[PDB]
Amino acid sequence: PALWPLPLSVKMTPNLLHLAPENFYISHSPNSTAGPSCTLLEEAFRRYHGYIFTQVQQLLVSITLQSECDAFPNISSDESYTLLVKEPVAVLKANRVWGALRGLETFSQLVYQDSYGTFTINESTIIDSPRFSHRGILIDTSRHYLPVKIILKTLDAMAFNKFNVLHWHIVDDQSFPYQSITFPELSNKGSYSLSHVYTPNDVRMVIEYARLRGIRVLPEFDTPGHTLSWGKGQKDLLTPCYSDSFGPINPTLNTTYSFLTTFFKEISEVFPDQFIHLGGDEVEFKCWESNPKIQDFMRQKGFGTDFKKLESFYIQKVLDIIATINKGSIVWQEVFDDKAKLAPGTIVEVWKDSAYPEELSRVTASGFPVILSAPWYLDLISYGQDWRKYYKVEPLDFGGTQKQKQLFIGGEACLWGEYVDATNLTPRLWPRASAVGERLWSSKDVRDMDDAYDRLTRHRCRMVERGIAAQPLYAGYCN
Amino acid sequence: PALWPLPLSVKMTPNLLHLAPENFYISHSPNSTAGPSCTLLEEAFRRYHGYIFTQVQQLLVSITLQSECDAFPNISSDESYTLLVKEPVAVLKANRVWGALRGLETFSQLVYQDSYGTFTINESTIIDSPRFSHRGILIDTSRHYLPVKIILKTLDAMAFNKFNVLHWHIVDDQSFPYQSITFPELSNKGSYSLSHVYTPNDVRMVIEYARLRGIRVLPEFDTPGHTLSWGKGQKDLLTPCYSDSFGPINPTLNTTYSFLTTFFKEISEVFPDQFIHLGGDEVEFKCWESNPKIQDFMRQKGFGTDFKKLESFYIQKVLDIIATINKGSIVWQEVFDDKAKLAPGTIVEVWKDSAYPEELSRVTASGFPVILSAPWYLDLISYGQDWRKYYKVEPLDFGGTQKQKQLFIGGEACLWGEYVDATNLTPRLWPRASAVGERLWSSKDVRDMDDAYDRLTRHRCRMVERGIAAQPLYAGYCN
Ligand SMILES: *[C@@H]1O[C@H](CO)[C@@H](O[C@@H]2O[C@H](CO)[C@@H](O[C@@H]3O[C@H](CO)[C@@H](O)[C@H](O)[C@@H]3O)[C@H](O)[C@H]2NC(C)=O)[C@H](O)[C@H]1NC(C)=O
Ligand SMILES: *[C@@H]1O[C@H](CO)[C@@H](O[C@@H]2O[C@H](CO)[C@@H](O[C@@H]3O[C@H](CO)[C@@H](O)[C@H](O)[C@@H]3O)[C@H](O)[C@H]2NC(C)=O)[C@H](O)[C@H]1NC(C)=O
Ligand SMILES: CCc1nc(N)nc(N)c1-c1ccc(Cl)cc1
Ligand SMILES: CCc1nc(N)nc(N)c1-c1ccc(Cl)cc1
Ligand SMILES: *[C@@H]1O[C@H](CO)[C@@H](O)[C@H](O)[C@H]1NC(C)=O
Ligand SMILES: *[C@@H]1O[C@H](CO)[C@@H](O)[C@H](O)[C@H]1NC(C)=O
């Protein structure tokens, strides 16, 4: 049995137990607060049965507190569980449905076949819970359109890896595949074609599918930069340049914040998750500055020719729109770095590789929750075993007091879409993102390279077996 | 119509012609030297018909010289053809079957559908032939075992790209998947498992399949280094180390050259191609030197403690074995660089990235035919549009007289198997190898980056359409 990520506490015995496919149930212990009526658990029981294939007859699942079956996971969902692997009835015990889903994955990783076909598990006890609560994968469905199928498999692979946030970078300069109901033109004119679109029903599917796995779907609607496609269905939203044609959203018109309010109100209803990622990265001033109506606004606010001041103005106003619909904001570092005024609990995401520990220190010294992604740019491929580099990151090596560190809520592996699509996305992501997943779940001090190597190669074969085309770590084979 | 690689001469007119799927034949002109009895051409006609889907009724194919239907391509096979695209009957005219196969690919790339579905081709004339005759892809089926299927698709993708040599690096340190009939133990004990093997019938298939496409299958049986797996089924073949256990083949025993003669005689019958690649790269001396029976041989030949002298001894003896069965040798630069005596027409393959133009000059100054692969290590992946780097290579920028340059016979894109297998091989290879293919086929002076970009993105969609999962070049979509 290969475990990935490696649970917080594992105690095994040398007593072997066996399982009979046509004769082994997973079900609710009579004391569980969840029962048959509970889809999320029901579907899990069935799909894991499949994954899995001196007696163990059964795995009882006991949800201790109110199960939250019908809810969406959020930031502080309880993921803890325990596993007592014993004859004749094994037990998975969790506070909440979210714990149970994690535990089921761990249990599956413990069943295995000996040289003769026999399904075997060791007597053991497992105590487990995540080291960090925000465990993301970022996907880019604008640079390339990812079909819904491929998004779902990703969700499956994320489950197998205990990741819990799908950071959906849904739109960008190149294409606007999100179909909006109050704004039909955005996608009609900005999508790559009528069949590179996510309908409200595609969005619905992805969301449910992720929920059923304890995954949160965090939408990113990046502004004011990276918004070239928004302009095709929105008259007057983008700044016109005086010489490129268009630059960032024009932050000086009422019509602009008008639209943005309507829009984000729709978003706030479509995506159940607490947070909206607002982007705010990489905004070009060269354009705003060549433009005379902006010139004029700069004069009227006395902003000089510091265009950060204007980036601030805009972003802050959007921040307020988000606050007004009672949602949280996430924001790329640039927003913080350019000193906009942020509400308490705004999450800042540190993505710039340049001395990010000092970034982490600054953000946390300001008292904001912080998410790391900088050393985890997976689109940034290179030769050989780079998973090691990702795995060896210690997110908490920065200067900062205890309370400061408590503000670090986790991180994301990023796969940006410039060079990625259906043809290459999976082998590119996996197992490389696994290294990231284990570091974000297991202990601080889980770091033997040889052992990591060993479980990872075996985990990867498992993934392949479950139809994730994850790529090799090094020379070898499966079975 | 996107062309790749771009034929030597293309003359188009603005007259459009149309094609009717259920009504368009490719067949033999009555004067062709090939007719129905000719499988290679028959199968081509059918498979291209499929690829393809004011009138063009037909494409007549005229083979001018003896067709060579039943032969294997070799180094100097005639690949030239012409294409007269006219109503009502178009004409493909080639000296040989090999030309015809190229031409058919070009014709397919010229048919296309307008906005209304209509199959269209422009009136045009095409004159085409390759700038270099050796156009390889190297695959590694030892670091990972590639199933026969995936080898075949590669062969298909190579055809679509006019590549004509599959450099089969079949065995290496990690695994010996080649099943040998005079040596059953080699694969029984050296393969990854009984089901990671190439049977004589797998080899037969691959060979025919490539032949049917004008592809030569060049086997590499690398020695004396990279031979760790040979040892599991061959007692006494590998040097034992005195402290790793085993090092390179022990070049001092008779039993060694005994085996190697039997073996290469089997190879010489199994693989139809003229050349055998002998490897000869990266041989470690640290082992031979720790060993006392080698020590003793060194003394008896008065080789001092220059172990190149012994690498020479061995390799030369193998060279003679090859010569004795009337086959050609190919050899990695190290063999030349360590000054072994080579027969006239031994091909040296330059693979080391360190100032290879001066390597090219030295080899060609010695009068040997030379093959470049150094700037074309495709396993050496990196971020972004690296196809450009590959495409911009000018193989002939080295110092050397005309006659010297005439010795440069071509090159290979290499995909070594340390990090590669079925899960990632195709998107890794394609379209990156396309850049290599065009540079090895088209003119010296075909090099507009924008145009290359444009045809390549379109070529790549074609490949995807024909079920090659080739990866993107940059942001965008197909159709
Ligand atoms: C899960 O259960 C399996 C099966 O009990 C455990 O594997 C077994 O481990 C013992 C060591 O505790 C092996 O015994 C050994 O015998 C040889 C002499 O032949 C010697 O090298 C050692 O000193 C040792 O006594 C036993 O072979 C081994 N494997 C099997 C298949 O029975 C396994 O350790 C348990 N896993 C965990 C993580 O607890
Ligand atoms: C293959 O045949 C097609 C169809 O004839 C050729 O495309 C056509 O090219 C002409 C230019 O020769 C286009 O005419 C243009 O008209 C506009 C005014 O509306 C003006 O911008 C130009 O000065 C020019 O006169 C025509 O639209 C165009 N396309 C089609 C679909 O008919 C094509 O060039 C041929 N390809 C090659 C490589 O020869
Ligand atoms: C937040 C940065 C960012 N934002 C957007 N909208 N797109 C991107 N492609 C990136 C990016 C930055 C660095 C690398 Cl190496 C790769 C991608
Ligand atoms: C001829 C060199 C060679 N021979 C063998 N048998 N295996 C290899 N993997 C390589 C190799 C060398 C450099 C790179 Cl970058 C990648 C692979
Ligand atoms: C623009 O903004 C102000 C205050 O924010 C608003 O009330 C006003 O009517 C708007 N003006 C125009 C000209 O659209
Ligand atoms: C080894 O080599 C020689 C000559 O090449 C051969 O004739 C001889 O009999 C061999 N000796 C042994 C001891 O195997």
Side-chain angles (χ1 to χ4, degrees):
Chain A
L3 298 172
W4 196 286
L6 191 68
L8 171 73
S9 180
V10 176
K11 303 173 194 280
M12 304 256 288
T13 92
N15 292 332
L16 303 177
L17 303 179
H18 304 318
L19 287 76
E22 280 261 76
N23 200 41
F24 169 93
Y25 329 137
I26 301 153
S27 40
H28 310 270
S29 61
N31 62 347
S32 176
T33 77
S37 45
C38 173
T39 322
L40 172 151
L41 281 194
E42 282 313 295
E43 294 313 317
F45 300 171
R46 196 172 39 182
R47 91 181 157 265
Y48 278 95
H49 192 283
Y51 299 139
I52 301 182
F53 310 91
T54 2
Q55 211 186 151
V56 181
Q57 311 282 170
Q58 252 189 270
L59 175 59
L60 284 190
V61 178
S62 202
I63 313 313
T64 314
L65 306 169
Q66 283 165 20
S67 55
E68 293 173 358
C69 286
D70 288 352
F72 293 88
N74 66 51
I75 180 64
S76 56
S77 281
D78 198 338
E79 265 169 312
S80 47
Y81 66 84
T82 61
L83 249 171
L84 324 169
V85 190
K86 53 185 189 82
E87 163 205 270
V89 165
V91 178
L92 165 59
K93 172 167 174 187
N95 287 343
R96 314 275 193 200
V97 117
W98 324 112
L101 297 170
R102 305 301 173 242
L104 284 171
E105 180 56 28
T106 305
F107 184 87
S108 49
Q109 305 194 2
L110 293 169
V111 173
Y112 68 96
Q113 298 180 245
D114 68 14
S115 342
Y116 294 100
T118 326
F119 291 104
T120 301
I121 180 137
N122 285 38
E123 266 197 327
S124 59
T125 318
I126 276 137
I127 307 174
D128 205 18
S129 83
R131 165 185 191 192
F132 300 98
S133 53
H134 183 111
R135 308 191 301 285
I137 291 299
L138 178 156
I139 63 160
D140 178 349
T141 49
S142 177
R143 275 53 173 269
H144 286 101
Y145 170 90
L146 292 184
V148 167
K149 286 285 159 135
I150 212 101
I151 284 146
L152 305 190
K153 293 185 56 58
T154 313
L155 286 178
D156 289 349
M158 272 166 77
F160 306 158
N161 283 259
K162 321 208 176 103
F163 270 93
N164 55 10
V165 176
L166 168 71
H167 177 166
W168 194 351
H169 190 96
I170 180 153
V171 298
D172 204 288
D173 282 315
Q174 288 84 331
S175 73
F176 201 106
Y178 172 73
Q179 179 170 324
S180 152
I181 301 161
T182 48
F183 297 115
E185 290 325 309
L186 287 164
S187 87
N188 284 355
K189 269 81 173 272
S191 89
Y192 279 130
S193 83
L194 271 8
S195 61
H196 299 82
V197 165
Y198 297 121
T199 58
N201 200 74
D202 297 331
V203 174
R204 254 187 242 106
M205 213 157 304
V206 172
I207 284 158
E208 227 328 73
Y209 201 88
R211 190 188 76 80
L212 272 180
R213 283 152 187 90
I215 299 172
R216 294 166 49 201
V217 185
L218 168 72
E220 183 182 339
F221 279 93
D222 186 12
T223 66
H226 285 284
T227 59
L228 223 281
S229 62
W230 299 51
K232 324 297 278 272
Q234 194 60 24
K235 309 294 175 223
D236 286 317
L237 177 88
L238 301 168
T239 316
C241 308
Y242 290 72
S243 284
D244 304 358
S245 299
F246 298 104
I249 296 155
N250 170 358
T252 79
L253 316 168
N254 289 326
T255 58
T256 291
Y257 301 103
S258 225
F259 171 83
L260 277 172
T261 303
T262 307
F263 185 72
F264 279 108
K265 160 87 147 233
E266 173 185 295
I267 291 315
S268 76
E269 295 150 13
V270 156
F271 286 88
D273 198 80
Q274 191 34 298
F275 288 79
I276 300 169
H277 196 310
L278 290 173
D281 60 306
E282 296 188 312
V283 187
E284 260 290 12
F285 302 136
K286 291 231 211 188
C287 187
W288 282 341
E289 178 196 5
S290 79
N291 177 290
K293 263 133 148 76
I294 289 149
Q295 280 287 277
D296 272 327
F297 198 74
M298 292 292 288
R299 232 193 57 258
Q300 313 172 280
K301 295 260 154 189
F303 283 166
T305 56
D306 177 19
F307 279 95
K308 295 156 203 279
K309 276 184 124 72
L310 171 72
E311 173 167 53
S312 246
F313 182 78
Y314 165 81
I315 198 53
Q316 226 152 332
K317 287 184 70 77
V318 172
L319 286 175
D320 313 317
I321 299 184
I322 301 304
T324 292
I325 56 251
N326 304 308
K327 295 281 234 202
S329 289
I330 295 171
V331 134
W332 298 105
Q333 60 184 107
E334 277 106 341
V335 178
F336 175 94
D337 290 345
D338 294 338
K339 340 127 226 182
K341 143 136 280 126
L342 315 184
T346 312
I347 312 171
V348 179
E349 179 167 17
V350 170
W351 70 270
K352 284 173 167 176
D353 224 15
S354 221
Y356 60 80
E358 335 220 56
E359 261 301 297
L360 289 174
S361 290
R362 285 181 302 264
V363 180
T364 55
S366 287
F368 299 118
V370 76
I371 290 164
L372 191 62
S373 65
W376 292 318
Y377 277 43
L378 295 220
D379 53 300
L380 289 193
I381 57 156
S382 70
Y383 187 67
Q385 283 191 62
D386 63 357
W387 67 271
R388 310 174 63 100
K389 194 188 56 174
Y390 299 138
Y391 186 90
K392 281 178 161 153
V393 160
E394 181 27 49
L396 298 208
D397 301 336
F398 56 97
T401 56
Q402 282 317 312
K403 229 182 56 163
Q404 219 162 326
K405 305 267 160 83
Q406 281 176 352
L407 281 172
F408 187 97
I409 60 176
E412 318 196 306
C414 289
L415 189 50
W416 294 95
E418 282 87 344
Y419 306 105
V420 179
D421 69 12
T423 60
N424 74 346
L425 173 155
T426 290
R428 183 158 288 166
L429 239 190
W430 309 109
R432 281 202 310 146
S434 293
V436 177
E438 167 153 289
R439 166 70 44 238
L440 289 188
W441 175 284
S442 306
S443 319
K444 190 174 214 319
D445 57 347
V446 173
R447 37 204 303 131
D448 174 9
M449 284 333 265
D450 287 345
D451 186 55
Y453 182 63
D454 185 76
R455 295 168 301 94
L456 189 52
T457 42
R458 288 151 65 240
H459 182 51
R460 178 256 165 174
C461 285
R462 183 151 52 208
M463 281 185 296
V464 173
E465 210 181 331
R466 296 184 200 180
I468 306 299
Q471 68 179 354
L473 283 187
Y474 187 57
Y477 72 115
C478 305
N479 289 318
Chain B
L3 298 172
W4 196 286
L6 191 68
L8 171 73
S9 180
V10 176
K11 303 173 194 280
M12 304 256 288
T13 92
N15 292 332
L16 303 177
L17 303 179
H18 304 318
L19 287 76
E22 280 261 76
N23 200 41
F24 169 93
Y25 329 137
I26 301 153
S27 40
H28 310 270
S29 61
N31 62 347
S32 176
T33 77
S37 45
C38 173
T39 322
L40 172 151
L41 281 194
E42 282 313 295
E43 294 313 317
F45 300 171
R46 196 172 39 182
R47 91 181 157 265
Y48 278 95
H49 192 283
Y51 299 139
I52 301 182
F53 310 91
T54 2
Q55 211 186 151
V56 181
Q57 311 281 170
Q58 252 189 270
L59 175 59
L60 284 190
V61 178
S62 202
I63 313 313
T64 314
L65 306 169
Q66 283 165 20
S67 55
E68 293 173 358
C69 286
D70 288 352
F72 293 88
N74 66 51
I75 180 64
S76 56
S77 281
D78 198 338
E79 265 169 312
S80 47
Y81 66 84
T82 61
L83 249 171
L84 324 169
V85 190
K86 53 185 189 82
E87 163 205 270
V89 165
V91 178
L92 165 59
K93 172 167 174 187
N95 287 343
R96 314 275 193 200
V97 117
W98 324 112
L101 297 170
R102 305 301 173 242
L104 284 171
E105 180 56 28
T106 305
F107 184 87
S108 49
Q109 305 194 2
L110 293 169
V111 173
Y112 68 96
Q113 298 180 245
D114 68 14
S115 342
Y116 294 100
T118 326
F119 291 104
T120 301
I121 180 137
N122 285 38
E123 266 197 327
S124 59
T125 318
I126 276 137
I127 307 174
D128 205 18
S129 83
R131 165 185 191 192
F132 300 98
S133 53
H134 183 111
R135 308 191 301 285
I137 291 299
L138 178 156
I139 63 160
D140 178 349
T141 49
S142 177
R143 275 53 173 269
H144 286 101
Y145 170 90
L146 292 184
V148 167
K149 286 285 159 135
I150 212 101
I151 284 146
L152 305 190
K153 293 185 56 58
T154 313
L155 286 178
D156 289 349
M158 272 166 77
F160 306 158
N161 283 259
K162 321 208 176 103
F163 270 93
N164 55 10
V165 176
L166 168 71
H167 177 166
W168 194 351
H169 190 96
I170 180 153
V171 298
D172 204 288
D173 282 315
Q174 288 84 331
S175 73
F176 201 106
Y178 172 73
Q179 179 170 324
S180 152
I181 301 161
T182 48
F183 297 115
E185 290 325 309
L186 287 164
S187 87
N188 284 355
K189 269 81 173 272
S191 89
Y192 279 130
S193 83
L194 271 8
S195 61
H196 299 82
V197 165
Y198 297 121
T199 58
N201 200 74
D202 297 331
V203 174
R204 254 187 242 106
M205 213 157 304
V206 172
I207 284 158
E208 227 328 73
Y209 201 88
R211 190 188 76 80
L212 272 180
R213 283 152 187 90
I215 299 172
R216 294 166 49 201
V217 185
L218 168 72
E220 183 182 339
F221 279 93
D222 186 12
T223 66
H226 285 284
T227 59
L228 223 281
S229 62
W230 299 51
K232 324 297 278 272
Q234 194 60 24
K235 309 294 175 223
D236 286 317
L237 177 88
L238 301 168
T239 316
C241 308
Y242 290 72
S243 284
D244 304 358
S245 299
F246 298 104
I249 296 155
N250 170 358
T252 79
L253 316 168
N254 289 326
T255 58
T256 291
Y257 301 103
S258 225
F259 171 83
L260 277 172
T261 303
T262 307
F263 185 72
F264 279 108
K265 160 87 147 233
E266 173 185 295
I267 291 315
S268 76
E269 295 150 13
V270 156
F271 286 88
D273 198 80
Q274 191 34 298
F275 288 79
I276 300 169
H277 196 310
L278 290 173
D281 60 306
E282 296 188 312
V283 187
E284 260 290 12
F285 302 136
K286 291 231 211 188
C287 187
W288 282 341
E289 178 196 5
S290 79
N291 177 290
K293 263 133 148 76
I294 289 149
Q295 280 287 277
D296 272 327
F297 198 74
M298 292 292 288
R299 232 193 57 258
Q300 313 172 280
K301 295 260 154 189
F303 283 166
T305 56
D306 177 19
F307 279 95
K308 295 156 203 279
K309 276 184 124 72
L310 171 72
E311 173 167 53
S312 246
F313 182 78
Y314 165 81
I315 198 53
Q316 226 152 332
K317 287 184 70 77
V318 172
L319 286 175
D320 313 317
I321 299 184
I322 301 304
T324 292
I325 56 251
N326 304 308
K327 295 281 234 202
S329 289
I330 295 171
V331 134
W332 298 105
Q333 60 184 107
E334 277 106 341
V335 178
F336 175 94
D337 290 345
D338 294 338
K339 340 127 226 182
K341 143 136 280 126
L342 315 184
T346 312
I347 312 171
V348 179
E349 179 167 17
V350 170
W351 70 270
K352 284 173 167 176
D353 224 15
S354 221
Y356 60 80
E358 335 220 56
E359 261 301 297
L360 289 174
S361 290
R362 285 181 302 264
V363 180
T364 55
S366 287
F368 299 118
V370 76
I371 290 164
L372 191 62
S373 65
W376 292 318
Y377 277 43
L378 295 220
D379 53 300
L380 289 193
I381 57 156
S382 70
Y383 187 67
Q385 283 191 62
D386 63 357
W387 67 271
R388 310 174 63 100
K389 194 188 56 174
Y390 299 138
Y391 186 90
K392 281 178 161 153
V393 160
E394 181 27 49
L396 298 208
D397 301 336
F398 56 97
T401 56
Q402 282 317 312
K403 229 182 56 163
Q404 219 162 326
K405 305 267 160 83
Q406 281 176 352
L407 281 172
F408 187 97
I409 60 176
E412 318 196 306
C414 289
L415 189 50
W416 294 95
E418 282 87 344
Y419 306 105
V420 179
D421 69 12
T423 60
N424 74 346
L425 173 155
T426 290
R428 183 158 288 166
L429 239 190
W430 309 109
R432 281 202 310 146
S434 293
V436 177
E438 167 153 289
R439 166 70 44 238
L440 289 188
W441 175 284
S442 306
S443 319
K444 190 174 214 319
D445 57 347
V446 173
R447 37 204 303 131
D448 174 9
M449 284 333 265
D450 287 345
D451 186 55
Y453 182 63
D454 185 76
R455 295 168 301 94
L456 189 52
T457 42
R458 288 151 65 240
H459 182 51
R460 178 256 165 174
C461 285
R462 183 151 52 208
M463 281 185 296
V464 173
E465 210 181 331
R466 296 184 200 180
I468 306 299
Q471 68 179 354
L473 283 187
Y474 187 57
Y477 72 115
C478 305
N479 289 318

